[PDB]
Amino acid sequence: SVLQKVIEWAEHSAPVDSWDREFLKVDQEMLYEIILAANYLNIKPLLDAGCKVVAEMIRGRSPEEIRRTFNIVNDFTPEEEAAIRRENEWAEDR
Amino acid sequence: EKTLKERFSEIYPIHAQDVRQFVKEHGKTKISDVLLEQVYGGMRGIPGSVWEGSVLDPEDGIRFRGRTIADIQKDLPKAKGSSQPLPEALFWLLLTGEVPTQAQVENLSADLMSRSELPSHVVQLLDNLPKDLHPMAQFSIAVTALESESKFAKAYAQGISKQDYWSYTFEDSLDLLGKLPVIAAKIYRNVFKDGKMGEVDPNADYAKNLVNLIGSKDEDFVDLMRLYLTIHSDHEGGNVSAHTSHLVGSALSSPYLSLASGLNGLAGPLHGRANQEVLEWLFALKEEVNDDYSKDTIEKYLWDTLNSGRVIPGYGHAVLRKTDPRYMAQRKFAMDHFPDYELFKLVSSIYEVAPGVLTEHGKTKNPWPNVDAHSGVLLQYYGLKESSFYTVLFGVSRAFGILAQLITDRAIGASIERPKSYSTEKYKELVKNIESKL
């Protein structure tokens, strides 16, 4: 199925295409495999498109929300998370 | 009772015929020579302008249609309860040469305020200009942006007789004058305050609309602006702002482009910031003397200023042989409204000793103060402490004399100003031929 989707894409942070957005409205596993197939066949534009969609699912969300949504265990101590939060605030506009 | 446009339409044909006869009978009369040093010195002393509104009397000061400052203070109509002349009344005098009645001035004020609503695109651009764009630049930008409303430009494009130019020029000028207080106060609120403005009072006069929109309801401030806007309205046609507006207007540019160009000349540091330069000098003096305004202390400072080679700003003119009546009119306003104001006490103490000190030094032709030596302190009293905005106020006033002359020039069909230029090399060749044919 992934090979079929890749050929569809060939037939049809730079901005993402809306046709590619509908093309990547599939489930998370299929989205993972599409990125894998583009990386394997050196289809870099399709690779970047799949990454940007994943990035939008992550962007602006808290660490806890990302861990639940993407199934990741927290191995940080509470003080380590606070120090990282301050570092990330240094990267913000203020 | 006749309006301003009706009365002017009856006066300008007389002036037009008088000029036509004068040039026909005396046109070949020589009035001056052009020396090489003059064309290389800014045309100083060359009579190259016909400005009907005002002439400088060497002993009585500026004369508006022959009337001195004392004359216009006595004869011009005033607002109800005020002893100060109205700038609208002086505009009537500048354009017609006659003193209007009380009802005629009030109807002219109502006509101006009825033309005071700014178009949406002008309010939009003013609200989007950055605060570090100088107020004078925002002033001429807003005036230029009104060109889309020019009745003269539209009439000229459609095709109108030359004898009808003045009519559309008159309407453009009054449409423009009515919006100048709104534009000026919009810039003041946007740059220096919170950008919030009041609404135009349809029954308020020109200066009162400016003060209220700036954000003050003090009637003494309103009276100050009435005096300020009146006495700065016009001062001959040789100055850069007046000459520029006449020059641009002679090419049949609308009053919007003529005033905007005149304002850009007024923005020049050598032209429109004399009262700010006085204010800086007063503040530096006030710091050195630590607010000791005694006769001995001030005289010592003035002598040190002159002996070091520097001048006393506001004092010293090349023509007027007495004190500027505009200065005395501002001194009187301060005496009657805030005689204890510390900054006025400093200005007054300078007035009492500077002519005597400058005389003993003996290097100043006429050691007397002009209008700029006193205007700054009066503005400082009511909260207008931003010196960069003072040239905008000067423009709101000077636009009266500028537009009066522009309407007159279009009525008499004044010609385009087109002198001749040469390079320095061609001036050398020209001088050699003149001197060889002695």
């Binding site: 690779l47 120090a83 | 010196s387």
Partner: protein, 338 residues
């Protein structure tokens, strides 16, 4: 399924889009993020480059000054030793555990503190900062502003501010240029306080192509402040020059100046360990790149708190929002922009 079963190369691309979110997820992404900026730093300034040799201790002292805020995050990487001649760069404490902060410290000019602040024309200050050679060609994404810090005793002495001239240029190279705000900026100052005034942005000082193929990454930026007030306002400490920074405060809300309370000490604005790093870095660059003598003596430059700023915004429709200002993170902390 999980995000962790994706290849490492895909994770690195995800880190190019959402680095700050991912680096807070688990130790894996934090360490991979630190490694990513190790590669960025060393591909820019190789391990054998002279810059690492001359800035090592001063750079470590700057990063160490951040420990009260980030020590628990820095100590996630444990196999580090104190900086020394025999300790490799990839094992140096305050560097190998801080590539993200080290890289940003080298990519932007640090602050310049006026060390003579508490002592016709008269020189108020003359100092240095390190400047990336390509600051101009990257101005769209990363403009380099020039901000000046003054103590102003009252609104009336503020009128002398446009008469303090800021002169900038490459140390012993090229012509000097003057950066300045509008001449009437003082008229927007209405009370005593400490003021940060934006003098615009750093102008084009040279053609960058003359540095193509020369291996130069940083230049010494010389700054000179001149008192041309023709008064005693600076001699009487009614107008005190505190220093300069190049921080783009509040990019989303363009401003002309902002005020903080004058009771604050100079350490509330300037990190001495950062200024010492930038100063000695620039000095070492001047000694390595030019034979001519530096025209001024080598100076010795030696707890972030919430300080509310009241801005005078550049756009007239921008209104005040005090609640937002209270909630924002501190502005006297490092600005990580890349």
């Amino acid at each position: 399924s999980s995000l962790m079963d994706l290849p490492l190369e895909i994770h690195l691309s995800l880190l190019e889009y959402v680095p700050n979110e991912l680096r807070a997820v688990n130790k894996y992404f934090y360490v991979l993020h630190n490694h990513s900026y190790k590669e960025k730093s060393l591909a820019w300034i190789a391990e054998d480059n002279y810059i690492w040799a001359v800035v090592k201790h001063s750079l470590c002292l700057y990063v160490k000054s951040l420990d009260p805020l980030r020590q628990h995050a820095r100590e996630i990487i444990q196999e580090t030793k104190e900086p020394g001649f025999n300790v490799p760069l990839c094992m140096t404490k305050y560097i190998a555990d801080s590539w993200y902060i080290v890289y940003n410290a080298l990519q932007y000019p640090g602050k310049i503190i006026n060390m003579g602040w508490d002592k016709k024309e008269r020189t108020l200050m003359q100092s240095l900062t390190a400047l990336p050679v390509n600051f101009w060609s990257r101005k769209k994404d990363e403009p380099t502003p020039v901000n000046v810090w003054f103590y102003v005793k009252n609104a009336h002495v503020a009128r002398y501010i446009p008469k303090i001239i800021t002169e900038i240029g490459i140390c012993n190279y090229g012509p000097k240029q003057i950066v300045a705000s509008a001449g009437y900026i003082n008229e927007l100052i209405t009370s005593e306080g400490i003021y940060c005034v934006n003098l615009g942005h750093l102008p084009r000082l040279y053609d960058e192509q003359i540095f193509e193929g020369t291996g130069t990454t940083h230049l010494p930026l010389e700054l000179k402040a001149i008192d041309r007030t023709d008064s005693d306002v600076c001699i009487n400490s009614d107008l005190v020059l505190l220093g300069y920074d190049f921080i783009p405060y509040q990019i989303s809300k363009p401003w002309l100046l902002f005020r903080i309370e004058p009771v604050n000490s100079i350490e509330a604005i300037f990190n001495y360990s950062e200024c010492s790093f930038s100063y000695q870095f620039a000095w070492s660059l001047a000694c390595l790149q030019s034979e001519e003598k530096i025209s001024f003596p080598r100076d010795t430059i030696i707890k972030p708190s919430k300080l509310i700023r009241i801005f005078v915004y550049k756009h007239p429709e921008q209104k005040q929002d005090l609640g937002q200002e209270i909630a924002l993170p501190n502005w006297n902390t490092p600005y990580l922009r890349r």
